[PDB]
């Protein structure tokens, strides 16, 4: 939970600094400063490691060819006045703007489609960082975009400490070292800047350790299918 992370930061890592309040808990006024750094740390960990991969269904409309990955066009977000909401969200999968990289794209039946392929004029291109361009949209089709997902963003004004930070206990130290590095690096004092650099190096060492141990089952080899494809 966020309370545990705040206590851990207050005593042990952010101890000899103002934000830690001498190990008596993070002040209720410095929340929008640890939370901003925490969002960056969670984004870094969720982009460098595959801690959350999710899929989103994009319903194709006859007059729309550029589909934006924004919650304003979501089926569950009822606050938006968009006439056509092509994102197909469910109470289970909500699509809270947590998109880090669009990896794979499928169709309604389940056949993979090419992504960003120029020679094949049947591929789904990506114009901008959050858009999906379908040159050939059909009113009776739906996409099945799968992406690497981010942690649901914790608002800067969040006050409830029961908001759960969903990271494995192995990356707790990596996140904490990242937060310490980011908070220690703001000041231009050489002595404090050196500590910030040391925290950055230690965070990059923890990440290297987790990569070397593959605690998230990311770098796992697959069955070779090249002989079958080449006709052996």
């Amino acid at each position: 939970k966020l309370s545990e992370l705040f206590q851990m930061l207050s005593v042990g890592e952010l101890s000899l600094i103002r934000t830690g309040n001498d190990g008596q808990g993070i002040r209720t006024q410095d929340y929008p400063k640890v939370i901003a750094q925490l969002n960056a740390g969670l984004t870094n960990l969720h982009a460098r490691f595959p801690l959350l991969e999710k899929e989103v269904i994009i319903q194709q409309y006859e007059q729309i060819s550029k589909y934006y990955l924004r919650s304003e066009f979501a089926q569950m977000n009822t606050t938006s006045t968009e006439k056509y909401k092509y994102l197909m969200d469910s109470p289970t999968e909500r699509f809270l703007d947590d998109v880090i990289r669009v990896e794979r794209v499928f169709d309604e039946c389940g056949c993979p489609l090419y992504l960003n392929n120029e020679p094949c004029c049947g591929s789904i291109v990506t114009p901008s960082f959050d858009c999906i361009q379908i040159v050939y949209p059909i009113e009776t089709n739906a996409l099945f975009v799968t992406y690497r997902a981010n942690h649901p963003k914790i608002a800067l004004t969040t006050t409830d400490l029961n908001t759960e930070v969903r990271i494995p206990a192995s990356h707790e130290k990596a996140l904490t070292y990242y937060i310490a590095s980011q908070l220690y690096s703001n000041s231009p004092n050489p002595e404090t800047a050196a500590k910030g650099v040391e925290w950055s190096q230690r965070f990059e060492a923890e990440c290297t350790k987790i990569e070397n141990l593959d605690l998230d089952n990311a770098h796992i080899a697959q069955t070779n299918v090249k002989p079958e494809m080449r006709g052996w």
């Binding site: 101890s15 000899l16 001498d22 190990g23």
Partner: protein, 50 residues
């Protein structure tokens, strides 16, 4: 008023928590040192060095 003689026991009682003036000044400086040290701001070596 009754003036008292200035003896050796008024400066140092030869104990760490003595009743002398030097002992009281050491206790007062040690109070600030302990207040700072109770917030993990200085290590024991630096505590003794200061």
């Amino acid at each position: 008023v009754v003036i008292e003689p200035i003896t050796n026991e008024d400066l140092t009682t030869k104990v760490v928590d003595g009743t002398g003036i030097f002992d009281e000044l050491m206790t007062a400086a040690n109070a600030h040192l302990s207040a700072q040290w109770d917030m993990e701001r200085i290590t024991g070596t630096q505590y003794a060095e200061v």
